[PDB]
């Protein structure tokens, strides 16, 4: 396979001062719940984290209600039962749908240039952009080279780089001609497939951006804490550096 082009979405959380947008995360959670969840799970995400600070921050009662839709298996009882905030979201219902808990981190959207890593250095790893691009990258018409040879059960996607491609679409050397490839995931979205309470727009574009932010949070729930810890450490050290510099300066003065 290889690496490709991802639409560079400006997410609120990017940048050293970036932070999640609580409402977007909430919208994203609805998309995940109403659409994605039918096939993809988030096995490492404790439902109760929907309440913790720095995320969707839903009221414990709502979360408690929410957890109810999930029909979990008790670790003792063994018999089934409704879900509790202490439970994790379930495993993927669709055997080949990958778990989405860590996706925003298990994919890079910015590569190179020339395999130098300079692109990421300034753009980030690009996982949410990648996810956005995939949700956003299902075109109505397949590229020409494939017209009559589309694998059955697959769908062409502009961003997906690890899929199969028809023979009729590889060059003289076997390298694929298309920007993307064939993915086993049928186009998930469709304008207003989700009714947002606050009447926010549910264009495939909007939903994709929201669920992507949500998945970023599901993967790095401690993003904000991490960055706050960062500033802190940098401030201490910047101060301490200046003082050690002066101390160093004064101490050597008595020699050279």
């Amino acid at each position: 396979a290889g690496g490709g082009h991802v639409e560079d979405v400006p997410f609120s959380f990017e940048g050293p001062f970036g932070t999640f947008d609580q409402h977007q995360l909430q919208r994203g959670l609805q998309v995940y719940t109403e659409v994605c969840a039918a096939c993809h799970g988030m096995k490492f995400v404790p439902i109760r984290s929907l309440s913790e600070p720095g995320g969707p921050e839903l009221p414990e009662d709502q979360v408690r209600a929410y957890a109810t839709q999930f029909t979990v298996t008790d670790e003792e009882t063994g018999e089934d039962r409704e879900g509790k905030p202490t439970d994790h979201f379930p495993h993927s219902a669709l055997e080949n749908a990958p778990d989405l808990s860590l996706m925003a981190k298990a994919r890079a959207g910015f590569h190179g240039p020339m395999g130098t890593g300079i692109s990421q250095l300034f753009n980030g790893i690009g996982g949410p952009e990648y996810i956005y691009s995939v949700l956003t990258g299902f075109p109505e018409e397949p590229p020409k080279c494939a017209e009559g040879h589309e694998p059955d059960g697959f769908y062409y996607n502009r961003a997906f780089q690890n899929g199969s491609v028809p023979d009729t679409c590889k060059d003289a050397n076997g390298v694929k001609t298309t920007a993307g490839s064939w993915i086993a995931m049928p186009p998930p979205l469709m304008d207003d497939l989700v009714e947002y309470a606050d009447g926010h727009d549910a264009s495939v574009h909007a939903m994709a951006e929201d669920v992507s932010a949500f998945l970023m949070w599901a993967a790095e729930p401690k993003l904000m804490a991490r960055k706050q810890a960062g500033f802190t450490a940098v401030m201490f050290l910047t101060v301490l550096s200046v003082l050690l510099y002066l101390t160093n300066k004064r101490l050597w003065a008595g020699v050279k």
Binding site: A106, G115, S241, Y245, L251
Partner: protein, 428 residues
């Protein structure tokens, strides 16, 4: 063995202690060693390394308190650390990125030595102990990387245990022994955990000998000119005591380094890593973009440069009646690249210590430095043309530098004259 001043019991507690256990005296004679006045910023990496070792050990002990070394629980347990443990996310990232800082620092530390002849007599032991530390560091970091049990973890373990499978005759056995079975599985993860915990202490023990070693000879400086030992008088002209003069320069440098380090950890903790390790180990599928940890890339590049089609490999395969095929050749080339660096004290025939006064040396040295960067960079590229060629040339230059160029420059170079004293150089 520089002439200076030894410890003197002042307080009562001091005199009492001194007549029983001279530990305060030893600390003093260590912290008060006369150090060349001319050391430059390239002498700060040893302290950065000591700090890293301590950082890795304390964050490690802590991580081990929440980590489960079992295939069904290992990955989940690292996610539990990330999401549930107070400050877990930050401790994990500090340990991970700490490994990188640890290597960025040894490579600078190593190249500093290659340039100023810090490995030359009488410093060969310091150099050899350092080489042992380097081997341990690599083995330690490799096993640590396996603990999370992600995709890179599993396949990297498969490949590295595979290296031993390449040794002729005994190989299959050694590999079965390291694995505890027919494949990388729980028995493998379990023993790697135990060894990942043990090695850092061995390193600490070696570092102790390392420090003792350079203390026995005294630090080398940028001029390669030793400190005058004839009288306290002139010795002082050449030096200043480690405390507080260098201790403070070092701590200051360390603070600047940690400033960048924490900025990395706080703002781009996953930059120096591989996204595929956030995917659970899948014994039935190797990721298409599997790539080693950056600090392993250069040696990795040397290893895959040697395919069946390389002439020297074909000659070797012929001459050895097939014992040495490309597989084993690549393994020998890789470990050999490390071994020739360990032998540099006996390959560098020039009697001039510092490469600052070696005009031809300066050229090959910087080519070596660039070569290291190129090797690192090609390691992350595909095996297709022209990378395959670049890796061969880079590998060639690496062995050429140590086995050919350095022994030759020794007899052929016209070295510029160095100052007669550190004092001289310092005032300049």
């Amino acid at each position: 063995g520089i002439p200076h001043d030894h410890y003197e019991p002042r307080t009562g507690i001091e005199k009492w202690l001194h007549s029983r256990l001279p530990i305060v005296a030893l600390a003093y004679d260590t912290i008060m060693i006369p150090t060349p006045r001319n050391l430059n910023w390239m002498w700060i990496w040893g302290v950065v390394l000591a700090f890293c070792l301590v950082l890795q050990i304390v964050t490690g002990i802590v991580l081990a308190m929440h980590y489960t070394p079992h295939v069904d629980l290992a990955f989940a347990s690292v996610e539990h650390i990330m999401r549930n443990v107070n400050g877990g996310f930050m401790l994990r990232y500090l340990h991970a990125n700490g490994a990188s800082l640890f290597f960025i620092a040894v490579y600078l530390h190593i190249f500093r030595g290659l340039y100023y002849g810090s490995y030359k007599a009488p410093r060969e032991v310091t150099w050899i102990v350092g080489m042992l530390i380097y081997l341990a560091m690599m083995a330690t970091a490799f096993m640590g990387y396996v603990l999370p049990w992600g995709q890179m973890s599993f396949w990297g373990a498969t490949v590295i245990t595979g290296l031993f499978g390449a040794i002729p005759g005994i190989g299959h056995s050694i590999q079965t022994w390291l694995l505890g079975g027919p494949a990388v599985d729980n028995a493998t993860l379990n023993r790697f955990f135990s060894l990942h915990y043990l090695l850092p202490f061995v390193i600490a023990a070696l570092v102790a000998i390392h420090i003792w070693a350079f203390h026995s000879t005294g630090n080398n400086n940028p001029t390669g000119v030793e400190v005058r030992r004839t009288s306290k008088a002139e010795a002082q002209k050449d030096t200043v005591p480690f405390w507080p003069y260098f201790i403070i320069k070092d701590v200051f440098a360390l603070a600047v380094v940690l400033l960048v380090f924490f900025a990395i950890v706080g703002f781009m903790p996953n930059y120096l890593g591989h996204p595929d390790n956030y995917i659970e180990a899948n014994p039935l599928r190797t990721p298409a973009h599997i790539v080693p940890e950056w600090y392993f890339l250069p040696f990795y590049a040397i290893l895959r440069a040697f395919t069946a089609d390389v002439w020297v490999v074909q000659i070797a395969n012929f001459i050895s009646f097939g014992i040495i095929d490309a597989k084993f050749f690549g393994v020998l080339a890789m470990f050999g690249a490390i071994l020739v660096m360990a032998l540099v004290p006996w390959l560098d025939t020039s009697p001039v210590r510092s490469g600052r006064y070696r005009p031809m040396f300066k050229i090959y040295f910087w080519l070596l430095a660039a070569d290291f960067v190129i090797l690192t960079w090609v390691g992350a590229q595909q095996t297709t043309f022209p990378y395959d060629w670049i890796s061969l040339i880079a590998s060639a230059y690496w062995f050429a530098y140590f086995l050919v160029i350095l022994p030759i420059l020794g007899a052929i170079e016209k070295p510029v004259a160095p100052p007669a004293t550190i004092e001289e150089d310092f005032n300049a």
